[PDB]
Design a protein around this ligand. Structure first.
Ligand SMILES: COc1ccc(CNC(=O)[C@@H](Cc2ccccc2)NC(=N)NC(=O)Cc2ccc(OC)c(OC)c2)cc1OC
Ligand SMILES: COc1ccc(CNC(=O)[C@@H](Cc2ccccc2)NC(=N)NC(=O)Cc2ccc(OC)c(OC)c2)cc1OC
Ligand SMILES: *[C@@H]1O[C@H](CO)[C@@H](O[C@@H]2O[C@H](CO)[C@@H](O)[C@H](O)[C@H]2NC(C)=O)[C@H](O)[C@H]1NC(C)=O
Ligand SMILES: *[C@@H]1O[C@H](CO)[C@@H](O[C@@H]2O[C@H](CO)[C@@H](O)[C@H](O)[C@H]2NC(C)=O)[C@H](O)[C@H]1NC(C)=O
Ligand SMILES: *[C@@H]1O[C@H](CO)[C@@H](O)[C@H](O)[C@H]1NC(C)=O
Lengths: 240, 97, 241, 97
């Protein structure tokens, strides 16, 4: 294991609302760049790098998309784990060093709809459960797949339609990253009933940070992700 | 390279175990590439904070490597917000208790 | 056996905005209050059942189990009461306004000293309200007396370890005391494998002319077997089995 | 007297089975002393109504005792609201299917 000495962190005393009550986890360990650190605190991975605790300044995520699976995921500090991906890693350069931001060429719905037509900015976020895109564009995407508004930018799709939905392809670094309908939908269950949640949420990210699409757990789960601080790049490979 | 196992709750929350302090006090955290701060609940959380009744709490009095800071912080995500104060200590990945 | 209420007017729901009805275990609602509050002045099921003389006694009663594991979860008796689900004798209160099942509440006493509804107030007996409901300012004062903290939307949580040391809360109706123990007025809730204790009292003001009103919800009916009598316009209570 | 068994979901929802139509179409309902209308989801519910997707729906075409009405209704409770149209039929307690 690793021991990161003299790390500055927050002792939370107030958590208003219900946000953190049901959450399975105790806290958050941020892994983005120092630029967005509240109080300009040196982040864990930055301290880890300055202390030379790993030979390679990269970290990687495997996220399982089956909640029954063992393990539920794996973070590799200082390397990648070939047991959780197939083929080779394809890299994209970080375009702004704050979030792990990359250039998104376009978003294609197999039935015809094109979003982010002339290219846009996107972030790779393990802490966002869903794919997030601009309100108006996500509204168009949801109409193309027959999804209906639920609440707060989220949409539901009749479960019987999922098998016949078009695949959605994200073009990054000139390559297509396809999400099949099983990949972009989530099966949700409450009080002995089941529903299918759209894995795309509409939310506008205001400037100066936004507009931004967010490649959340839905995307990372299908594509094993490498975060490289040595070369300021993000790598993707098909997850095992 | 160090592997850190993660648990998956409903394809929505991915989290792993870390340690803070000497000896390490274990916490589960989301390793979050969309933010840059580390935080955990404090043993000094307000009674009004229901989340801290059922989550692990850091106790600075039990750590020999705890270094007082005390600067206030306020973090806003998309989901919601939280506040507290800063402290300094050793972070272990995995917990290594 | 059963009953068949002929020519009943009911609603075919086509729109249900928000998330309210999505998670609900039930498909619909069958209202059992008075015709006065019926939307579109529709003759309610029990009124139609009475007009058709399908029962001998124009009364209906509820047993509600407070243990979710128990079989049955509850029982509605149409045209009668069921002595297997109550002990002792029924005590009756006159309905004060025939719209909801409204009765006069003499006062609310917290064992530790606090008195609410000091000079008497109006209350309704509602099987469709999960919790006890009272005015925001008075419930806020009750929650402070039991060490509960605000959750969201008028609801409060109590540290589970404090429940055993909480005072009893007594509702005075028809000159008699109806005690709710901390076990009766708290609900054990578990979300993502975590155990919290919800206060069974919710603060919400119901605007006049209908309000102010306290609501004796499932928390109360669960401890006190309830009889709704349309023949004499009264509500009966007995200790539940 | 007629007994109607109820189910208990989490000490929050108490409901039982009824029948509407000839032959009876079964529905679960809260017998609610705080309101005065009977309603169930329609087979004619709007696509936008997610609750309808996973609840039983009344089909007037399958009932020989269905009498058309069609008058609009809107019901609001403390919790939320709903709308639709009126119809007339036989209500069975219990379902008796
Ligand atoms: C503009 O409005 C919205 C904008 C965006 C979002 C969704 N995305 C985030 O909020 C990102 C931050 C971000 C904000 C803006 C731009 C780029 C990144 N969040 C995080 N990376 N991390 C966390 O939030 C920590 C956390 C906390 C609680 C959790 O469960 C209870 C949890 O479970 C996994 C994780 C929602 C909005 O509103 C709904
Ligand atoms: C002033 O605001 C508030 C006032 C009062 C309340 C709580 N009490 C009610 O709302 C009563 C009506 C009432 C309103 C006003 C005064 C006296 C009676 N409800 C009912 N008797 N029946 C239903 O609601 C049907 C129903 C629907 C959905 C259900 O679960 C998904 C459900 O599960 C059991 C039952 C909340 C307020 O706001 C939070
Ligand atoms: C408490 O921790 C904070 C961390 O934010 C310390 O202040 C930072 O110090 C670093 C260098 O060590 C700077 O790059 C940051 O800009 C500083 N942040 C702020 C907001 O000023 C701070 O010195 C520590 N000590 C005390 C007593 O507060
Ligand atoms: C549809 O049903 C409504 C509701 O039952 C009927 O109108 C009501 O009729 C009763 C007497 O039968 C009156 O006491 C109510 O005041 C009436 N309500 C309203 C809002 O007018 C109505 O006649 C039925 N028929 C049609 C075709 O709409
Ligand atoms: C990515 O960045 C490296 C180093 O800054 C540079 O050599 C390379 O040409 C960049 N790639 C693209 C596609 O711009």
């Amino acid at each position: 294991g690793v021991k990161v000495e003299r790390q500055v962190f927050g002792e939370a005393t107030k958590q208003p609302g219900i946000t953190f009550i049901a959450a399975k986890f105790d806290g958050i360990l941020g892994m983005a760049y120092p630029r967005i650190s509240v109080n300009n605190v040196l982040p864990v991975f930055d301290n880890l790098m300055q202390q030379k605790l790993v030979d390679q300044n990269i970290f990687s995520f495997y996220l399982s998309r089956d909640p029954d699976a063992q393990p539920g995921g794996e973070l590799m500090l200082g390397g990648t784990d070939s047991k959780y991906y197939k083929g080779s890693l394809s890299y994209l350069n970080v375009t702004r060093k704050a979030y792990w931001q990359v250039h998104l060429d376009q978003v294609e719905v197999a039935s015809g709809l094109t979003l982010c037509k002339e290219g846009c900015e996107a972030i790779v976020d393990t802490g966002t459960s869903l794919m997030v895109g601009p309100v108006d564009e996500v509204r168009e995407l949801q109409k193309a797949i027959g999804a209906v508004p639920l609440i707060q930018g989220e949409y539901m799709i009749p479960c019987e339609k999922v098998s016949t939905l078009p695949a959605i392809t994200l073009k990054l670094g000139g390559k297509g990253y396809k999400l099949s309908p099983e990949d972009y939908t989530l099966k949700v269950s409450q009080a002995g009933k089941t529903l299918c949640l759209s894995g795309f949420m509409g939310m506008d990210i205001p400037p100066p940070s936004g507009p931004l699409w967010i490649l959340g757990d839905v995307f990372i789960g299908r594509y094993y992700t490498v975060f490289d601080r040595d070369n300021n790049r993000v790598g993707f490979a098909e997850a095992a | 390279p160090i592997p850190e196992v993660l648990k998956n709750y409903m394809d929505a929350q991915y989290y792993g175990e870390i340690g803070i302090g000497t000896p390490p006090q274990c916490f589960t955290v989301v390793f979050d590439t969309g933010s840059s701060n580390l935080w955990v609940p404090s043993i000094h959380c307000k009674l009004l904070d229901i989340a801290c009744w059922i989550h692990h709490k850091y106790n600075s009095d039990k750590s020999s490597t705890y270094v007082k800071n005390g600067t206030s912080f306020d973090i806003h995500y998309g989901s919601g917000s939280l506040s507290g104060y800063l402290s300094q200590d050793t972070v272990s990945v995995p917990c290594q208790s």
